[PDB]
């Protein structure tokens, strides 16, 4: 912690803050992979 809130905030920006970055970065890669699906579908179709 309750008293931490202060120092906790800092950790929140990193942990919680860095969390959002991970979700975005991870999604970025997922999007790239999905590109292959379409490419294959186009080549297999087409």
UniProtKB/Swiss-Prot annotation:
Membrane topology: Single-pass type I membrane protein
Record bears the keyword Transferase: no
Example of a GO cellular component annotation carried by this entry: membrane
Ranges that cross the membrane: 22-42
Domain of life: Viruses
Residue ranges annotated as Cytoplasmic topological domain: 43-46
Main location: virion
Topology Periplasmic: residue spans: 1-21
Protein name: Capsid protein G8P
């Amino acid at each position: 912690g309750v008293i931490d809130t202060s120092a906790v905030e800092s950790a929140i920006t990193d942990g919680q803050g860095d969390m959002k970055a991970i979700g975005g970065y991870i999604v970025g890669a997922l999007v790239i992979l999905a590109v292959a699906g379409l490419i294959y579908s186009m080549l297999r179709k087409a």
